Design a protein around this nucleic acid. Sequence first.
RNA 1: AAAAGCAGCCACCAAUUAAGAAAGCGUUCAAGCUCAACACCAAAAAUCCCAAACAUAUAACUGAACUCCUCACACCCAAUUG
Length: 140
Amino acid sequence: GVIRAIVRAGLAMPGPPLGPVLGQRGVSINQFCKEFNERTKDIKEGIPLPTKILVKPDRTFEIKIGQPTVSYFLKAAAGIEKGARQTGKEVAGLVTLKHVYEIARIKAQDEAFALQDVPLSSVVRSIIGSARSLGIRVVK
RNA sequence: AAAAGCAGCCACCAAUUAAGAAAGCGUUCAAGCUCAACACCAAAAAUCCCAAACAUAUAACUGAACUCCUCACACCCAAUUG
Ligand SMILES: [Mg+2]
């Protein structure tokens, strides 16, 4: 019916997360990989991009890609790749306010990513809480 | 190389208008099914089980050599004794 993937854009086509996991349901991996590579080339690579693949009963696909994620997104915005081993103890990310405003503004895009709130405060609160759960803390 | 929500540890925020970084079930692994919440909502052993038997007429009856009623009283213990 519907599957949710998070394979990295730059990553061409692995095996487990796109081979047997999908073969059990019968698919055409060629077209899926081609569309994924096209969407990856359409924008700078090196960032995960979710997707809402719509598996039709006629063995046809209609991929629906979106904006980057939140984990790696904030990890790259703060400047640290690997996260903390124990949070919130092992602090790491220390983001200011202007960067948070900018990242929230550029994230406020795809409606499929839960954008049922008119103001942006409610939306940015979610990513702020997610960062708090991570080894990142909001400065100022 | 993997556990993403349950091989192991951390904090467990918070957007859905209004509620789990997940309380179970099932997944190598994700897939699927529920829940927390919201909208009216005790019996068994060998000859054969063993007293008939009734729930609905007024709390009181029956029941000794125990006590009493007429008379006179020494006349219900092993061994032993007087
Ligand atoms: Mg007498």
